Amino acid sequence: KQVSWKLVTEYAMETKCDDVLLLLGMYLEFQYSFEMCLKCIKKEQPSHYKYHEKHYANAAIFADSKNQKTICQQAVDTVLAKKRVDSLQLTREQMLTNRFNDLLDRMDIMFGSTGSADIEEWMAGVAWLHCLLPKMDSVVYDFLKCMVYNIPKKRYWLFKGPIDSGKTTLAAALLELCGGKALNVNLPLDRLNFELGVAIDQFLVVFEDVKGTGGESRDLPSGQGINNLDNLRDYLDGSVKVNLEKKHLNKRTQIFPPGIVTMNEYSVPKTLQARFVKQIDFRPKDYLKHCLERSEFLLEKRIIQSGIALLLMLIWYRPVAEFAQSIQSRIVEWKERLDKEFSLSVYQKMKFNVAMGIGVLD
Amino acid sequence: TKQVSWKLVTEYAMETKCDDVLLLLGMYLEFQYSFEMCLKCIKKEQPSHYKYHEKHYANAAIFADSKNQKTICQQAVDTVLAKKRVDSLQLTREQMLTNRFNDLLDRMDIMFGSTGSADIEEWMAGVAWLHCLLPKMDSVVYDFLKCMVYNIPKKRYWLFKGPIDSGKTTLAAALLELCGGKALNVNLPLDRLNFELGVAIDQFLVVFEDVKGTGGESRDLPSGQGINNLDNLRDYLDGSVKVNLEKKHLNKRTQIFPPGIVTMNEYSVPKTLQARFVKQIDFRPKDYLKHCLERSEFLLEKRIIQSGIALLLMLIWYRPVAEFAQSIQSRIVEWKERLDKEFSLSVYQKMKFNVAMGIGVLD
Amino acid sequence: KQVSWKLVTEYAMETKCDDVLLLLGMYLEFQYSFEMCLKCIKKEQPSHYKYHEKHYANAAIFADSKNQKTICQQAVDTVLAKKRVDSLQLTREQMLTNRFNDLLDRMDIMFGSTGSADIEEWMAGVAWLHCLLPKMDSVVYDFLKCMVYNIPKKRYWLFKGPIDSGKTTLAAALLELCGGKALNVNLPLDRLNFELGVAIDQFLVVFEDVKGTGGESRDLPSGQGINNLDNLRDYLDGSVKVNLEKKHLNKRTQIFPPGIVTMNEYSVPKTLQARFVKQIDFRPKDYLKHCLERSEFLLEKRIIQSGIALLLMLIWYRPVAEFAQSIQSRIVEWKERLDKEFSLSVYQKMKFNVAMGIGVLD
Amino acid sequence: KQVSWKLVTEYAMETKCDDVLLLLGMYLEFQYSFEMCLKCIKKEQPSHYKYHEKHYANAAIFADSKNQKTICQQAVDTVLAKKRVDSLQLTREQMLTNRFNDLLDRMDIMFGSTGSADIEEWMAGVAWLHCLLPKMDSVVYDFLKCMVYNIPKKRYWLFKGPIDSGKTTLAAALLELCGGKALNVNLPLDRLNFELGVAIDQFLVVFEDVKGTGGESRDLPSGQGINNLDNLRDYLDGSVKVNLEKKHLNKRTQIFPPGIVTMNEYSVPKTLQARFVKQIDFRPKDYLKHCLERSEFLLEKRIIQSGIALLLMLIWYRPVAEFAQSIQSRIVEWKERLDKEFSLSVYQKMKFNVAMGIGVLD
Amino acid sequence: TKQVSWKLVTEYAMETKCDDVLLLLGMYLEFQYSFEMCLKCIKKEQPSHYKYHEKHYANAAIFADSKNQKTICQQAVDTVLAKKRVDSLQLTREQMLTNRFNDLLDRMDIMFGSTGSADIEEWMAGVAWLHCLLPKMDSVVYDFLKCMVYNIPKKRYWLFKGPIDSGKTTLAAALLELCGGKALNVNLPLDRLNFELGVAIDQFLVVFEDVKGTGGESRDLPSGQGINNLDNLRDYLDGSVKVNLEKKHLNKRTQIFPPGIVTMNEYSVPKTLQARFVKQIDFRPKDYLKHCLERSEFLLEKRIIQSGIALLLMLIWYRPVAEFAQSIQSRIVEWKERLDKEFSLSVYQKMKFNVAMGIGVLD
Ligand SMILES: Nc1ncnc2c1ncn2[C@@H]1O[C@H](COP(=O)(O)OP(=O)(O)OP(=O)(O)O)[C@@H](O)[C@H]1O
Ligand SMILES: Nc1ncnc2c1ncn2[C@@H]1O[C@H](COP(=O)(O)OP(=O)(O)OP(=O)(O)O)[C@@H](O)[C@H]1O
Ligand SMILES: Nc1ncnc2c1ncn2[C@@H]1O[C@H](COP(=O)(O)OP(=O)(O)OP(=O)(O)O)[C@@H](O)[C@H]1O
Ligand SMILES: Nc1ncnc2c1ncn2[C@@H]1O[C@H](COP(=O)(O)OP(=O)(O)OP(=O)(O)O)[C@@H](O)[C@H]1O
Ligand SMILES: Nc1ncnc2c1ncn2[C@@H]1O[C@H](COP(=O)(O)OP(=O)(O)OP(=O)(O)O)[C@@H](O)[C@H]1O
Ligand SMILES: [Mg+2]
Ligand SMILES: [Mg+2]
Ligand SMILES: [Mg+2]
Ligand SMILES: [Mg+2]
Ligand SMILES: [Mg+2]
Ligand SMILES: [Zn+2]
Ligand SMILES: [Zn+2]
Ligand SMILES: [Zn+2]
Ligand SMILES: [Zn+2]
Ligand SMILES: [Zn+2]
């Protein structure tokens, strides 16, 4: 007759839910009969159907509790605590491995009998992405290594190029591939600290569309983004720990996460450039655009900016020995799944269509 | 022992989709008095009241004696907020719009029903006026809805541009109500931008109303910082990466910023920002639209032409049932029949004619 | 043995008290014996004498409570909840009607045997005000219609004119007549949202003495008031709901209230002028000035700036039919009272004195 | 059957944990059976394996508590209280000695049969660092003396030089060697006090990469860092106590900690220079760069920027007599360990390789 | 019983004048261990500890098991702050100074006693060096004290002005400690200005350290807003009307701002601001003072010349017993006798001579 706080926490931990309202909403859905539950029968959400039955009894009681929010708060704090421990005790490679396993879990479902994704359309995204930059699978691989090694002053990559050249598309994919947050430093430096606070315990960070000053010649608006980053050298450096605040108060002193900076060809101060271990210049390509025009599903289903598309790319191009030993078995399994559905020629055909700019699946 | 049921208050909040603690408190306290001698119920007036007073009388009676009224309402409101959060993350955007349409249809059943106070004839007149605001108006609205539903990266915002009193706000307000969402003001100092932007959390779409730019001294347009601010929010408009929205002195949600509309006078738009606008609609003042209104005061007095319900009526009247979500098609059919029963093509065409003539829409 | 929270709430509701400290102070007065209470017998304050005896028992216990503030907070929240429901469920005319009934209650007392107001001095105020603008009673009537109708983009009146021309006097009187708040937008926009939040659930708002820039010619100091208003087009239009915040405890998305803007002949951008349905230009008048010099009570007793003076004006000049059906019976009573105390010539004599610049009651 | 708050506090005290989420996370790991706990048997984390068995019983109960965060807060407050007492009552040498003992504790594990660190790779770091500046071990020794003596207006050292000259590398190592915080004063003054509040109860502080002006000729971006420092003369002097704040959390009036300032050779006002007892000019050296290119582990494992590398350097170079009496015996043990691991010539070869610009362990 | 005594904790805080919740928490937790073989008590390291461990052992043992440790300490600290508030409003300014002197003398009794670590000879050397910093130094200090005690409207602030390293901070810090008070920094933006000012609540005096002005760019002096900020705080320096000091998101106290000192380099001072300064002392660098220190490092290493105890020792050595408050006089006489037996006039004069010669003060 008493709610089990521990069970709510268990559910939060199992789904890695660190959103109090989301947790509250999800758990309240379990208060209803699992025997007569359509959400479970239709297998709509794993975070729901894989847990409804076990949590039914506790949820029924939870529904009558007067401290619902408080209970969920402790549950979420436990998830945050776990993330804090992992950030301090796991190797960065282990962190990425956990991320990859979560993505593979989503893949098993989305490409399984209860999924609505078409593996063929996703491989088409892999094809398009592999035409965006030279040796794309190596670019992605080298990025992962850079993020994992997290070497002082060799932690950031710069994505520079004209409008609609693919900077955000790839940055977004990489961000989802590794896990992390996108930060906006173009806003006033007043609320800057709080924006930077979002990076606490994150694997990596992406400073999106940072604006500079000298660029009115190229019809580029001026902003303080670049000046702001140049005032954050100890953040990009990753040598000394910085002081992040995320709760209207100082919450954590830590090495700032490594990451990416994307921008529109503004001038970059040498002091800031020294923080970028690699710079990639993106170039708009007619065929990529024309291909997208006839391959609308790549944007509508958000495939080319997905970390899942990048993960598939790695599974298709990279040798098993490069992946963490603990996950290799699972990788081999997906390599076999892919070979059984896409011959080399078929994939080559997709890339061909991209270069020709004529519908990837044509 | 006569203990108030928190679960019952929560159920009431859920059924009325009440996410306002004070509103919830005020409403529940009304169920405190006898259901028998209640003018509110017998005279109808408010569904959120008469459809629940009897069922909640007993619990409300106890609630009236509680020393934790606000706390109880808080948990009820949090449950409603939690449901909104789950839906924003788990429903398809089409399902979201469909839920919104069903809510509007519920209001329409009442307002145009026995206990209602609306005159369908006056609302259809609103449809007529709106159809003369832009070319192929019903297609403009349909295309807008698909854009909002598809939520395609960097192809999610429509720009409404034009002179004072050309219809930008009228249509934006109507679409905002049709889909559900919030209107944000980014003309205010960025020192409070995050707080305004935070209002977008869990919203279907957003409207950046009357954004001011620079270099507008030509058309006597006062300069402002709204355009510069939007250009600093490219990741918000793009909808590719999740943004960090703050609420209550604390970041409460990392999410893809909602798609939407930007309305503005004729200021210059930087290339970087223009790239985030999939479509631009140029609004133009029309004497006959003005003259028609002067003789059709009820359209403004009853807030009909700026209403999402007028647009829903338009969609029902013009679009094929097949274009609507499968789950609400039969409901759309009942309305098409209701409308066909109420108005012949001639009666409606006369309304559009009067509008084009700058005369009172009716008669 | 224990205090009845509901009783404190009933007192708050009956007195429409939404000020926690005022409520606390008032209820504590009821803890004393009422038998020989002079506040009661001399009927000094209705908020006191109509309730002391009834609340004595509960107040005596309240005085020994350890949660006085908390009890009154729930009471005030109930009052605020009622205002919230009313703002969303009553027609705007019903809102105005409720306000008029509250003013009439105050009038019943003021001009009653236990009141200290002289109805003749107040009618003198009506006379003076009726000489401030042409067809004043119609101006007030039209203003009320404008506020009730609350038509999109046709909701604000602009009071413009030189120093001491009567702008504030009339705006203050109208504010009290309808109920609402006066907002100062001449201060930094940084703390502007705070001020805008006071408009939550208000019937109308008055932006007092807004300063512009083009005014060197008239020795008028520059300010940001006009630019600030111009950044609030969606607030003035009243088409879409805006987002108001009343500190970290009461946010609200609602249509901004309609109202008034008063200013000193500064330049007004065409974009801002488009939000004003009517502009009234006030002019200083020597006789109005000379009259007041000889009718000091009009200022000392704050009569010409009172909503009660305007309500008396409407009662004297307007046809019963123009008032809401439910209040007409009461308006008739007051029309009879005014006719009993003032013949047409006696009232006309006050207007004569005003026009001639002499003591209104000469 | 009720959780022991004192035991959680003891665990926090033993691990010197002043991070509520970290504490919560670590203590929750103890709720699981330890009998066959691999984290324990494999001895992966001292903070875990040295306490799991002892805290299992209390932790199993804690897991069922509804006040987990509150329990952890009292525990963390105790750790913060202990640090506050220590900062006010211990001599600065005792503070440093306590830090050295904590570092030595980590060293016992790192280089132990259970550790993962290779003493050879760490001594290679000592060799590289010893080539960074002339008489490096004396530079570190003198720095320690300056920090311990904490002499008014003779407590800050300025590291100045071009990009990638070793300023941050050495400052980061000295910061970890002594314990303290790295502060960023390049950001706006708004949250300047927030950043400065981080210095509360810290042994020393490092103002990293302070931006100045008048450096356009050097292609150095302008900033307000130097200007900000010049407005903090009372902080740098350490004569009067200053007032530090951590929001509505922890406030404190204390003498500001002594420390380091690193910068890119901008101009320094005489007023500011007067607060720097010593200025070290760093210079890029081709061989140091070449050596690192062939000794990547020094950066990948963050060895040259480590306080442990510096402590090993002091142990190797400095006479036992210079260390605090209470720690001398432990220093002797380490000097014996090092002498056993490396002969004078074997260590000299490492320095030889660095000077030659080749792999340190080549 | 099994319950902690909050009253005892408060008593401990009151006796140690502890207004730091964390320090109080840390200190009381030390009493939970057996007093029997406590090393801290036998070694007589900290009075705040060894003089109370035995008495509080029992209560502390129970306190160690409490779940409301911080709450208990907060009530104790609040009591200390309440006492401070009462004293600020009800004691004469002389009594305030007297209580401060008595506290310093208590510290002197220990530091110069059998369990102390201070060398009276080294501190007397500090008096010697300081007496060489300005003409008639003992009279300067005396006059300063009278100015602070009298607290006369618009005659409450002294201005210390001079070049770098001339002794401004050295003397200001010593006087600050001698009288008790706070040092404020007004060179930082006025955003957090109200917060720094709040630090002066209930303080005897305030020191505005190193205030930067405009101009003076002719003497390599970086310009700042310090002076402009002080000129905007005229009602604070005047001390005629009460000002409103904020502390923790709210103006926690309306009071006469305390009197004090302002130190600065050679920047220009507006006449409006100069009018709040009753006395201006111009400090000047002296080679011999510098050379003396180079050969008397302990004066800086042990923070002697910047100490309030050095100035109290100076007053004791130079000032007539009659100048001290009646209540402390007998105590002052004891110290005068202690000093005379420790140092003959020629021995002290020799110290001043050495300073003047730029040689080690001692020997
Ligand atoms: N190299 C490319 N060539 C042609 N079209 C591209 C290329 N990359 C992306 N696109 C197209 O442009 C869209 C947006 O790309 P994206 O957001 O990555 O650009 P950036 O991030 O390249 O540009 P911006 O500076 O405006 O942020 C994609 O949705 C796609 O249709
Ligand atoms: N195309 C039009 N032609 C003539 N009158 C119009 C038109 N559109 C709207 N109006 C009239 O002008 C009023 C204001 O319209 P609306 O708020 O939509 O304009 P905008 O939003 O067009 O202009 P603004 O730039 O001032 O915000 C309407 O209430 C209506 O009376
Ligand atoms: N039309 C008028 N003619 C002469 N005197 C007037 C007039 N109107 C108001 N006054 C005088 O001015 C006072 C009120 O002015 P307010 O109504 O305060 O002026 P504004 O609001 O007219 O001027 P301001 O621009 O300074 O705010 C009255 O108390 C009265 O003495
Ligand atoms: N004296 C040196 N000579 C050659 N290379 C060096 C030297 N010092 C450091 N480096 C190399 O440069 C990198 C960065 O050094 P560090 O962060 O200490 O420089 P700063 O702190 O010297 O420069 P910045 O002003 O950019 O912060 C090191 O990781 C190393 O590879
Ligand atoms: N009059 C003096 N002549 C020579 N040296 C002095 C004098 N006063 C102080 N010093 C020396 O200079 C140091 C700093 O003095 P202090 O902090 O008081 O100067 P200011 O406060 O005089 O200068 P600043 O403007 O830099 O704060 C002392 O520690 C001491 O070594
Ligand atoms: Mg982009
Ligand atoms: Mg508009
Ligand atoms: Mg006025
Ligand atoms: Mg550096
Ligand atoms: Mg100084
Ligand atoms: Zn289910
Ligand atoms: Zn009812
Ligand atoms: Zn009474
Ligand atoms: Zn274990
Ligand atoms: Zn002891």
Curated annotation (Swiss-Prot), chains A, C, D:
Enzyme Commission identifier(s): 5.6.2.4
UniProt key word rRNA-binding: no
Domain SF3 helicase: 135-295
Zinc finger (T-ag D1-type): 1-92
Annotated region (Binding to host TP53 protein), positions in chain: 72-362
Catalytic activity: Couples ATP hydrolysis with the unwinding of duplex DNA by translocating in the 3'-5' direction; ATP + H2O = ADP + phosphate + H(+)
PTM info: Phosphorylated on both serine and threonine residues. Small t antigen inhibits the dephosphorylation by the AC form of PP2A. O-Glycosylated near the C-terminal region.
Gene Ontology cellular-component annotations: host cell nucleus
Binding site for Zn(2+): C37, C40, H48, H52
GO molecular function: ATP binding; ATP hydrolysis activity; DNA replication origin binding; double-stranded DNA binding; helicase activity; identical protein binding; single-stranded DNA binding; zinc ion binding
Keyword Cell inner membrane: no
Region (ATPase activity): 153-351
Record keywords, A-Z: Acetylation, Activator, ATP-binding, DNA replication, DNA-binding, Early protein, G1/S host cell cycle checkpoint dysregulation by virus, Glycoprotein, Helicase, Host nucleus, Host-virus interaction, Hydrolase, Inhibition of host innate immune response by virus, Inhibition of host interferon signaling pathway by virus, Inhibition of host JAK1 by virus, Interferon antiviral system evasion, Isomerase, Magnesium, Metal-binding, Modulation of host cell cycle by virus, Modulation of host E3 ubiquitin ligases by virus, Modulation of host ubiquitin pathway by virus, Nucleotide-binding, Oncogene, Phosphoprotein, Transcription, Transcription regulation, Viral immunoevasion, Zinc, Zinc-finger
GO BP annotations listed: bidirectional double-stranded viral DNA replication; DNA replication; symbiont-mediated perturbation of host cell cycle G1/S transition checkpoint; symbiont-mediated perturbation of host ubiquitin-like protein modification; symbiont-mediated suppression of host innate immune response; symbiont-mediated suppression of host JAK-STAT cascade via inhibition of JAK1 activity; symbiont-mediated suppression of host type I interferon-mediated signaling pathway; viral DNA genome replication
Residue positions binding ATP: G161, P162, I163, D164, S165, G166, K167, T168
Signal peptide: none
Comment, domains: The J domain is essential for multiple viral activities, including virion assembly, viral DNA replication, transformation and transcriptional activation. The LXCXE motif specifically binds to host pRB, RBL1, and RBL2.
Protein name: Large T antigen
From Swiss-Prot, chains B, E:
Cofactor(s) annotated in UniProt: Mg(2+)
Uppermost EC category: isomerase
Subcellular location: Host nucleus
Cofactor annotation remark: DNA helicase activity requires Mg(2+).
Catalysed reactions, as listed in the record: Couples ATP hydrolysis with the unwinding of duplex DNA by translocating in the 3'-5' direction; ATP + H2O = ADP + phosphate + H(+)
Positions of Zn(2+) binding: C38, C41, H49, H53
Record: residues binding ATP: G162, P163, I164, D165, S166, G167, K168, T169
ZnF bounds (T-ag D1-type): 1-93
Location of region: ATPase activity: 154-352
Presence of the UniProt keyword Translocase in the record: no
GO molecular function: ATP binding; ATP hydrolysis activity; DNA replication origin binding; double-stranded DNA binding; helicase activity; identical protein binding; single-stranded DNA binding; zinc ion binding
Claim: Transcription is one of the keywords in the record: yes
UniProt comment concerning the protein's domains: The J domain is essential for multiple viral activities, including virion assembly, viral DNA replication, transformation and transcriptional activation.
Miscellaneous information on this protein: The sequence shown is that of strain 776.
UniProt-recorded name of the protein: Large T antigen
Origin species: Simian virus 40 (SV40)
Residues of the full protein shown: 265 to 627 of 708
